[PDB]
Amino acid sequence: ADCGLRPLFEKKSLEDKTERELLESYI
Amino acid sequence: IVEGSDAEIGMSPWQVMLFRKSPQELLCGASLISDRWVLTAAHCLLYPPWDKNFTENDLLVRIGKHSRTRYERNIEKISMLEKIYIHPRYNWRENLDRDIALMKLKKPVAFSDYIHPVCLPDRETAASLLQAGYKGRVTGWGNLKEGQPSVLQVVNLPIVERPVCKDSTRIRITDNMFCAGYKPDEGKRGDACEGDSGGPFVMKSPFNNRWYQMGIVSWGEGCDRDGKYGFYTHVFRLKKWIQKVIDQFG
Amino acid sequence: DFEEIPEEYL
Numbered sequence: 001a002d003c004g005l006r007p008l009f010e011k012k013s014l015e016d017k018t019e020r021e022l023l024e025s026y027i
Numbered sequence: 028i029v030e031g032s033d034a035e036i037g038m039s040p041w042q043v044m045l046f047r048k049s050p051q052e053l054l055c056g057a058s059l060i061s062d063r064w065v066l067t068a069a070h071c072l073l074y075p076p077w078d079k080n081f082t083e084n085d086l087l088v089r090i091g092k093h094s095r096t097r098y099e100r101n102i103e104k105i106s107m108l109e110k111i112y113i114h115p116r117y118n119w120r121e122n123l124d125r126d127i128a129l130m131k132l133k134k135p136v137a138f139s140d141y142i143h144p145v146c147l148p149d150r151e152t153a154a155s156l157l158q159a160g161y162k163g164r165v166t167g168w169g170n171l172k173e174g175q176p177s178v179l180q181v182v183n184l185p186i187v188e189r190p191v192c193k194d195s196t197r198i199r200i201t202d203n204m205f206c207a208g209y210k211p212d213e214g215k216r217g218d219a220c221e222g223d224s225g226g227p228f229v230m231k232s233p234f235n236n237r238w239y240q241m242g243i244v245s246w247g248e249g250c251d252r253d254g255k256y257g258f259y260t261h262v263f264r265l266k267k268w269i270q271k272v273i274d275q276f277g
Numbered sequence: 278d279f280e281e282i283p284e285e286y287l
């Protein structure tokens with residue numbers, strides 16, 4: 001339900017340093 | 028993990044450490060999928076070629092960790108096993124087909140900034156993201172080289188086309204497996220290694236920005252070798268078995 | 278290599 005949303009990132013809308021690399025690969 | 032990076036704090040709140048009691052030692056990676064259930068690779072508990080077969084009592088679960096060796100007072104939670112469930116058709120004799128296992132905890136763990144479960148994919152999430160070239164993320168406290176890291180390591184690696192996977196090895200590859208890694212042609216590198224076993228291969232859904240465990244760290248030939256790739260258990264493919272076990276043992 | 282875990286966890 002709350003799965004996969006990280007308290008220190010997604011829950012505060014902060015992005016980790018390389019997650020955009022995954023996104024940009026989801027071409 | 029080779030050619031990876033230190034994890035950020037709170038980066039992999041579902042990362043779990045399989046720790047041996049005596050001698051106290053890292054055993055494997057693993058992951059938090061609920062407040063009572065951890066996901067790992069079957070070979071972490073059972074590999075007869077290496078006289079490997081652990082009982083619940085031989086082990087401990089360490090959730091919320093960052094530092095490998097430290098006892099992270101007030102942060103990590105360390106739990107006990109009530110029962111181990113191994114896939115009935117895990118193939119340890121030939122190719123580690125269905126390298127998957129469940130560990131049910133004694134009492135639930137409490138969630139925190141550092142402790143949180145990852146999702147398991149639905150057929151549609153998997154169909155959407157388990158595509159050659161899409162990248163996932165692997166994390167673990169394993170070997171830095173085919174040496175030991177101070178904190179959790181992380182790498183992003185592109186999923187690799189099935190023919191390539193198959194062409195890289197003499198092992199009979201199966202549909203319950205996928206491989207990941209850069210080609211030697213791509214430039215960058217990186218891989219999971221010894222000790223990362225049972226750790227999670229995770230991807231972030233661009234449809235709902237949640238993190239999904241697609242793979243489990245299972246095997247490889249050497250670590251980070253040119254034209255070799257990491258192989259991961261296909262979690263969605265065995266998902267029916269996962270809900271069965273959980274549905275059957277509450 | 279590993280720091281002492283509390284014996285409460287055994």
Ligand SMILES: N=C(N)c1ccc(CNC(=O)[C@@H]2CCCN2C(=O)CNC2CCCCCCC2)cc1
Pocket residue numbers: 070074121122123198218219220221222223224244245246247248249250251256257258
């Ligand atoms: N991605 C990687 N480079 C990587 C490499 C190794 C590991 C750890 N896993 C292992 O070491 C596993 C567990 C039992 C034997 N393993 C092997 O890796 C043994 N070597 C081969 C690989 C093929 C399938 C099983 C049959 C025997 C021959 C995890 C990841």
Ligand code: NA
Pocket residue numbers: 193194195196197198
């Ligand atoms: Na082959």
Ligand code: NA
Pocket residue numbers: 208209218251252253254255256
């Ligand atoms: Na490689």
